[PDB]
Design an enzyme around this catalytic site. Structure first.
Site, PDB file in Angstrom:
ATOM      1  N   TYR B 143       0.706  -1.223  -0.006  1.00  0.00           N
ATOM      2  CA  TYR B 143      -0.242   0.135   0.058  1.00  0.00           C
ATOM      3  C   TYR B 143       0.820   1.229   0.079  1.00  0.00           C
ATOM      4  O   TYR B 143       0.448   2.288  -0.546  1.00  0.00           O
ATOM      5  CB  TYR B 143      -0.810   0.051   1.261  1.00  0.00           C
ATOM      6  CG  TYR B 143      -2.121  -0.910   1.010  1.00  0.00           C
ATOM      7  CD1 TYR B 143      -1.945  -2.047   0.742  1.00  0.00           C
ATOM      8  CD2 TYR B 143      -3.427  -0.221   1.342  1.00  0.00           C
ATOM      9  CE1 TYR B 143      -3.391  -2.631   0.202  1.00  0.00           C
ATOM     10  CE2 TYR B 143      -4.663  -0.915   1.182  1.00  0.00           C
ATOM     11  CZ  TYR B 143      -4.523  -2.203   0.684  1.00  0.00           C
ATOM     12  OH  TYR B 143      -5.661  -2.868   0.409  1.00  0.00           O
ATOM     13  N   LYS B 193       2.585 -15.462   1.391  1.00  0.00           N
ATOM     14  CA  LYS B 193       2.535 -16.239  -0.025  1.00  0.00           C
ATOM     15  C   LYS B 193       4.139 -16.350  -0.097  1.00  0.00           C
ATOM     16  O   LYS B 193       4.853 -16.003  -0.882  1.00  0.00           O
ATOM     17  CB  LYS B 193       2.082 -15.418  -1.197  1.00  0.00           C
ATOM     18  CG  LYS B 193       2.045 -16.167  -2.669  1.00  0.00           C
ATOM     19  CD  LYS B 193       0.864 -17.193  -2.533  1.00  0.00           C
ATOM     20  CE  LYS B 193       1.170 -17.907  -3.917  1.00  0.00           C
ATOM     21  NZ  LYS B 193      -0.105 -18.632  -4.365  1.00  0.00           N
ATOM     22  N   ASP B 225      -3.854 -18.144  -0.947  1.00  0.00           N
ATOM     23  CA  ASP B 225      -4.850 -18.884  -2.035  1.00  0.00           C
ATOM     24  C   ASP B 225      -5.456 -19.990  -1.111  1.00  0.00           C
ATOM     25  O   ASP B 225      -6.584 -20.168  -1.265  1.00  0.00           O
ATOM     26  CB  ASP B 225      -4.112 -19.062  -3.211  1.00  0.00           C
ATOM     27  CG  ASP B 225      -2.843 -19.987  -3.039  1.00  0.00           C
ATOM     28  OD1 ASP B 225      -2.105 -20.133  -2.078  1.00  0.00           O
ATOM     29  OD2 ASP B 225      -2.722 -20.838  -4.028  1.00  0.00           O
ATOM     30  N   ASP B 249      -6.737  -7.117   3.821  1.00  0.00           N
ATOM     31  CA  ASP B 249      -7.558  -6.577   2.942  1.00  0.00           C
ATOM     32  C   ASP B 249      -8.578  -7.628   2.434  1.00  0.00           C
ATOM     33  O   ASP B 249      -9.587  -7.639   2.654  1.00  0.00           O
ATOM     34  CB  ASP B 249      -6.956  -5.887   1.759  1.00  0.00           C
ATOM     35  CG  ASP B 249      -8.015  -5.343   0.840  1.00  0.00           C
ATOM     36  OD1 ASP B 249      -9.227  -4.865   1.447  1.00  0.00           O
ATOM     37  OD2 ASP B 249      -7.994  -5.218  -0.334  1.00  0.00           O
TER      38      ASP B 249
HETATM   39  C1  LIG Z   1       2.984 -22.963  -6.050  1.00  0.00           C
HETATM   40  C2  LIG Z   1       2.514 -21.324  -6.459  1.00  0.00           C
HETATM   41  C3  LIG Z   1       3.552 -20.466  -6.881  1.00  0.00           C
HETATM   42  C4  LIG Z   1       1.415 -21.201  -7.452  1.00  0.00           C
HETATM   43  C5  LIG Z   1       1.092 -19.743  -7.803  1.00  0.00           C
HETATM   44  O1  LIG Z   1       1.021 -19.027  -6.773  1.00  0.00           O
HETATM   45  O2  LIG Z   1       0.702 -19.481  -8.968  1.00  0.00           O
HETATM   46  C6  LIG Z   1       0.051 -22.230  -7.352  1.00  0.00           C
HETATM   47  O3  LIG Z   1      -0.276 -21.521  -6.216  1.00  0.00           O
HETATM   48  C7  LIG Z   1      -0.859 -21.923  -8.407  1.00  0.00           C
HETATM   49  O4  LIG Z   1      -1.845 -21.344  -8.510  1.00  0.00           O
HETATM   50  O5  LIG Z   1      -0.473 -22.564  -9.413  1.00  0.00           O
HETATM   51  C1  LIG Z   2     -10.785   1.767   0.321  1.00  0.00           C
HETATM   52  C2  LIG Z   2      -9.266   0.793   0.483  1.00  0.00           C
HETATM   53  C3  LIG Z   2      -8.243   1.432   0.289  1.00  0.00           C
HETATM   54  C4  LIG Z   2      -9.348   0.024   1.792  1.00  0.00           C
HETATM   55  C5  LIG Z   2      -8.151  -0.836   1.765  1.00  0.00           C
HETATM   56  O1  LIG Z   2      -7.902  -1.617   0.871  1.00  0.00           O
HETATM   57  O2  LIG Z   2      -7.622  -1.020   2.888  1.00  0.00           O
HETATM   58  C6  LIG Z   2     -10.821  -0.678   2.012  1.00  0.00           C
HETATM   59  O3  LIG Z   2     -10.637  -1.620   1.377  1.00  0.00           O
HETATM   60  C7  LIG Z   2     -10.566  -1.390   3.442  1.00  0.00           C
HETATM   61  O4  LIG Z   2     -10.577  -2.242   3.757  1.00  0.00           O
HETATM   62  O5  LIG Z   2     -10.276  -0.581   4.370  1.00  0.00           O
HETATM   63 CA   LIG Z   3      -2.984 -20.859  -6.315  1.00  0.00          CA
HETATM   64 CA   LIG Z   4     -11.278  -4.190   2.121  1.00  0.00          CA
HETATM   65 CL   LIG Z   5       0.800  -5.975   1.340  1.00  0.00          CL
END
Ligand SMILES: CC(C)[C@H](C(=O)O)[C@@H](O)C(=O)O
Ligand SMILES: CC(C)[C@H](C(=O)O)[C@@H](O)C(=O)O
Ligand SMILES: [Ca+2]
Ligand SMILES: [Ca+2]
Ligand SMILES: [Cl-]
Ligand SMILES: [Cl-]
Lengths: 364, 364
Positions: B143, B193, B225, B249
């Protein structure tokens, strides 16, 4: 002459489900007169055990010599103490993607008829169904951007990753999403965080430039935090979701989980020449490996995406898709697709490959 | 002497729900003998209309003069065509966070007894309940990291954002998560991640260093993920989730949506002095504004977090929490918490504030 496929089955359930994808491909090879030759290479955990790294030189050179990579799954408890960054998953997948410039990731996910009860969505929401194709940009953004690393020591030691996108990179992936929406329900939802990220401000702007070539396709933009929420409430209102690398990683997995049936979901990661890497959406499930329990449909549908997208064999691809459909509607389900009481009806991995291959043979 | 609160009600439903948070605070001021003075300042859309920007100088200086900011919601259709980056939400919230060094975001989310049917989770999953507190790092990461911007032109024009974290930044937020887990169910799940991001490799390493001070707390790590998926399947197995800025977020909003009752959820964003900005988790709902329909509980519980965390008035905070509980279990629900057939039982915003304030008065 022959297509050449590099077969990288990897770890866990990878080989046993790959065996079924190969059995079904043999039926499609016979039926459509295709000549396809396959060579197997280690990758992932098995490659670290056999060759000391997750992506051996010989494996990478075999993929260079191929028309496509039919890829299984990588990873498992046994390598889960290596740094997260000498680990088999990241160490197989990111260099394959960077090396072959596999910028486009396509992950079709749908709630299949009759398996709505398996989705973790409340019953009135899964009853509506959904069919969302996630198109994720796979070779740019924060995954491969530079500078990446760390500097300093003690409290002030800092790490950094740079998310970087060029108009060229965004426009190539956006075109794929629009082209795919055209053939589906004609809506692209582009997912970004344009209220915070310069990359996403450029994302949003470029996707809007690309949209001029698709006046038949509706474009909306949504912030990634709101998309994560809206897929829980109204996933039936999305058609093609268009994401950068890190957002698409998260959202394509959220949508896969929302089907409740990851054993049915495949993935295509392609470059602009049509070479791709085709793999199931789910992992190597090392606890069920070797038992004939794993659902091979995801690996089988990976082969169908490989035929369609890399080998330009659309009829062969659709015959496998239909043969899967026939299994799902003729009582050939594996255990994880069956409710707790119906589980004695479960078919094993081999029984699923036999049925689907026989259906291809029978002309489905 | 007096606490001083800057009241930034913003747009949409913000003022009408703030009115109820102030009514309930008046009952807690009487009951506990607190002297609190309030000054209202424009922020967000109303500030752009009245002052030309979403965060006027005078508003920022009023927040500097206060013990805490009681914040409503910002945003709405009317400003939704300004660049996404002169827009009211980002333009109110990111500079308040950066300016007061509000590094810690706490978002408690739980499935309330009797409102499980509202969650978008399948009924057997929401029947298990959940109670997840998301602790998000709010002033670092991608951010506010630099360089951010763009360069170049035409196809090669590129934008970039840098995600950056120092050990000091990670360790301060990780300690808050561990301290919070200690008082809850003693588990922190750190979300990162680390298979791709240098920042997350340093994240994981630092959170493990912090863990030595909390041998009573279990620490697990999960990739973002996989966390997005696992919250759909087993949210009852998480206690405190510990995230960097961008991951938190996404995940805090996913968990908020999974309760199905965002009108009940509040947020605390605090610095290390105990000054904070307290706001509901949900948005300005501009379509229901002005109608007495909006659920004021989120703004009311924001006031309770403000009393606890900024004003160190734990008894007053818990009396409001209990008064909310009493409403929820005495048939005082607003329309959005009621199933389609029970909706004629809906209480209006004022009726909800009256009930909760009266319950505080009555000694709940
Ligand atoms: C293992 C990881 C690097 C990979 C990615 O983040 O793309 C996996 O999560 C996917 O979605 O293929
Ligand atoms: C408006 C946006 C910048 C904000 C963020 O991403 O933090 C909102 O989504 C939140 O979660 O407070
Ligand atoms: Ca993935
Ligand atoms: Ca948010
Ligand atoms: Cl971040
Ligand atoms: Cl990215």
């Amino acid at each position: 002459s022959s297509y050449q496929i590099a077969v990288l089955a990897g770890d866990g359930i990878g080989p046993e489900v790959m065996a079924e994808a190969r059995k079904v491909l043999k039926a499609v090879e016979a039926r459509f007169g295709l000549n396809i030759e396959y060579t197997e290479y280690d990758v992932g955990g098995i490659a670290i055990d056999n060759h000391g790294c997750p992506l051996p030189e010989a494996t990478l050179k075999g993929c260079e010599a191929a028309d496509a990579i039919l890829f299984g799954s990588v990873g498992g408890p046994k390598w889960e103490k290596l740094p997260p960054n000498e680990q088999p998953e990241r160490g197989a997948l990111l260099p394959l993607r960077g090396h072959f410039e596999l910028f486009c990731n396509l992950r079709p996910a749908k709630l299949h008829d009759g398996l709505e009860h398996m989705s973790p969505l409340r019953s009135d929401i899964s009853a509506r169904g959904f069919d969302v194709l996630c198109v994720r940009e796979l070779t740019g953004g924060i995954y491969f951007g530079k500078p990446k690393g760390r500097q300093g020591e003690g409290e002030s030691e800092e790490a950094f990753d740079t998310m970087r996108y060029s108009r060229r990179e965004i426009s190539r992936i956006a075109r794929i999403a629009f082209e795919a929406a055209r053939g589906r329900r004609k809506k692209v939802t582009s997912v970004d965080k344009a209220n915070v990220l310069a990359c996403s401000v450029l994302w949003r702007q470029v996707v809007e430039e690309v949209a001029v070539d698709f006046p038949d396709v509706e474009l909306e933009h949504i912030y990634i935090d709101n998309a994560t929420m809206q897929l829980l409430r109204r996933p039936d209102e999305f058609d093609v979701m268009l994401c950068s690398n890190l957002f698409g990683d998260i959202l394509s997995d959220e949508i896969a989980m929302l089907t409740g049936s990851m054993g049915l979901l495949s993935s295509a990661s392609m470059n602009s020449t049509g070479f791709g890497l085709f793999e199931p959406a789910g992992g190597s499930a090392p606890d069920i490996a070797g038992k004939g329990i794993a659902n091979p449909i995801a690996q089988i549908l990976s082969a169908a995406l490989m035929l369609r997208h890399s080998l330009k064999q659309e009829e062969a691809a659709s015959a496998i898709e239909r043969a899967v459909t026939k299994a799902l509607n003729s009582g050939y389900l594996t255990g994880e697709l069956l409710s707790s009481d119906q589980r004695h009806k479960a078919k094993t991995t081999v029984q699923m490959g036999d049925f689907i291959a026989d259906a291809v043979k029978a002309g489905v």
